[PDB]
Symmetry: C4
Subunit: 138 residues, 4 copies
């Protein structure tokens, strides 16, 4: 039901990494990735982009050459997602702020101008027959 | 009166957390939380995501290993609540962009057109009576 | 001409503070605030919130208990300002791909509506006054 | 064809700035910019605004005091590129959310309307035919 459908997606990605992270790194880098719990904190820190490279990544990468893949990808994917959650919320927000409240009126104020054009049609009708009973009663 | 309603909600949070902040940490991190004033600053520094974990929190969490709840919550609560302000500004923004004007310029373009359908209408009734009478007068 | 009104504000706020701190601080922290061009950079990293407090502002605050004002003022100010270039460009963007084209397509679908409406008006006058004549002979 | 147009500029801006940087900074800062990969990673780092001044730029400026040009230009270019991609996504986001329909639901509503106005242009012409024959059949 909306943003919440990627709010969950974020949560999935995050966990999956926090596990991947505990699974490769927990050994040599336990302050960061020893427990699953460990890795989550460390990830949410990486997410905030607070000291991610110089603090967490770079030191981990000198332990494992390939390890950038894991940090870079996480940051990429994770940010792409957080970006959407944000736009999604923007949208959803002004969708209330304005478009709900207005698509309401542009419909209803145009209901009136339907009825108005109707009344006039019925009038033109009734008249159009009065005039053609003069053309009969003659 | 609008967003400044939510900018209150923020100043409240900040206070709740700087008090819970000094009441909690000033013995051990006197530099960061040693006073109320002090504890604000650090909360603003943390709020800006500047060194929040490696610099302030992770030293603190050595001290009280539960205090991540203090920091994580405060980043979420604090961040979510700033996002409402960045939204409601994007909004009050577009009010004055567009909505205000195009919104009153569609009330009006309707009025002029409604008033036209009303004149349009009068004459139809008018015509009717003229016909009504031509009809009676010669039955 | 619009967005680049705040852009000029931003650059000016910059100058006031660059000067401000090259005066305030230049003697005591000459590596950051020594020269004006010095402070221009320093206030740039700060604008990007990079190590502003742990590596710059806290260092200076120990010198000058009050300088905190200087930093937190700037962050606050130079943010709202940038936020408005984002907002400025966002709006003037949407205006560009959508609003412009619609505020005018709907102005024009109403010209047409009016004109059709106008024609119906003359048709009723002539009709109203055919009947006028016709009733006076009768 | 839209965004991944932009998302290639970003891609190329990176490429350029990464060679320029390896050529410029390899011998002096070999961990950061020693090879080309080095310098890409190091840029992604700088791009995320992570530590980019205290940990990278400022030490480099120590060695090449003009180097700030490299880093400040890079931040600006890359982050403005990034802003477009964001904006262009937020727009095509709004298009699909809303403008797609409100701009084609109004096409339809004012279709319907022209139809009714045309309906009665009809009977008002018809009734001018009647009242017309009324005058001739005198
Ligand atoms: Br009408």
């Amino acid at each position: 039901p909306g943003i919440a459908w990627i709010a969950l997606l974020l949560l999935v990605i995050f966990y999956v990494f926090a596990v991947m992270g505990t699974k490769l790194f927990a050994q040599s880098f336990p302050e960061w990735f020893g427990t699953l719990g460990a890795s989550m904190y460390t990830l949410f820190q990486v997410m905030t982009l607070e000291s991610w490279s110089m603090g967490i990544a770079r030191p981990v990468i000198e332990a494992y050459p390939w390890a950038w893949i894991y940090f870079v990808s996480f940051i990429l994917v994770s940010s792409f997602t957080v970006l959407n959650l944000f736009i999604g919320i923007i949208i959803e927000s002004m969708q209330s702020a304005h478009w709900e409240a207005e698509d309401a009126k542009r419909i209803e104020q145009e209901q009136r101008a339907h009825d108005e054009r109707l009344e006039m049609l019925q009038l033109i009708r009734d008249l159009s027959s009065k005039v053609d009973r003069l053309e009969r009663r003659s």
